[PDB]
Design a protein around this ligand. Structure first.
Ligand SMILES: [Zn+2]
Ligand SMILES: [Zn+2]
Lengths: 96, 25
């Protein structure tokens, strides 16, 4: 199962959204549940937009798309640690 | 913000029940 790993990956992605004052672990769990229960990028984005009005739609879509891409990489055998490392790099915008 | 967190918790619980209903089938 990939659910526990995906939750950690989504929480890392959420940590990179500036001034996103929310309980990251619960938002990550919510996103992962919506996906597991058959959600699409659009249905998940729409549910998030109603909850978090301050964040732009493109930022939310970016988080959800990352979740779907990460699920696929996990199914393709990529380790969660490697995925997290790439997200940290994107969040920091630095090779270092 | 207390209200928003209660809402998110309620929504998570709803999704957990949906997942359970799917597994039972
Ligand atoms: Zn829509
Ligand atoms: Zn595939």
């Amino acid at each position: 199962q990939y659910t526990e790993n995906l939750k950690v990956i989504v929480a890392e992605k959420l940590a990179g959204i500036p001034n996103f004052n929310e309980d990251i672990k619960y938002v990550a769990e919510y996103i992962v549940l919506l996906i597991v229960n058959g959600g699409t990028v659009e249905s998940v984005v729409d549910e998030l937009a109603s909850l978090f009005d301050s964040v732009s739609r493109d930022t939310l879509a970016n988080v959800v798309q990352t979740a779907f891409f990460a699920l696929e990489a996990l199914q393709q055998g990529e380790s969660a640690e490697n995925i997290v490392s790439k997200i940290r790099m994107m969040n920091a915008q630095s090779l270092g | 913000t207390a209200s928003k967190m209660k809402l998110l918790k309620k929504k998570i619980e709803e999704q957990r029940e949906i997942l359970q209903k799917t597994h039972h089938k």
